[PDB]
Amino acid sequence: MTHYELQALRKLLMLEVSEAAREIGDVSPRSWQYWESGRSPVPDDVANQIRNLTDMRYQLLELRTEQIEKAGKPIQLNFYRTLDDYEAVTGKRDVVSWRLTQAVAATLFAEGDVTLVEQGGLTL
Template sequence: MNNLELQALRYLFFLSVKESATWIAGDSDTETWSQWESGEKEIPEDIIVKMEALRLIRKERIAAIVHKINDRIGNNTMRYFTSFEDFLQVYPGGDFLQWKLYQSAAAELFSRNLERLC
């Protein structure tokens, strides 16, 4: 994974640099994360593995929702949680990264005109 791909995935997952440093790198070091994205420092293998795992989770969730859409009759609507707290009301066992991936998937499905957001 190169620096541009890291940045693209961060954007795709709706994460800020600070959120990525906190939730993915686990150290809140925004300077180092920014250096990875600028190409100044090599991206550690464990960060690449985590980002690829998140990309796979997102892809699988979208595929599962599309499968359900194909079997659904009526309106296709998907909740869009504007805050982590709202997400936890519906998914009490969820975590911050699950919320971000959910939002990313919802936006993707909306952009494909497969779901309306509510």
């Protein structure tokens, strides 16, 4: 996977460089920056994890689309401003899953399929 493929997906998932560097790579931000600028090759394990996260974004989008089908109206999704807000609902400080919820909800909200709330959002 190239440096700009890696960056495009990392940004699309709403990961910060420091979060991706720590949770996906087991490396410093400077190393992840090198992977994103082409200064060092992207390790294949990292490319695989990034593609699997991209697949999960797609799957979550599909599940929310099925929920929208059942509801007959746009559903509500929680947009968690902070990891604490996410933790309040899930009990876990899972950075990558938190950013994933942000990416899914933001995409659906922009495309008109969903409304956003801080607390009433639909589960699963």
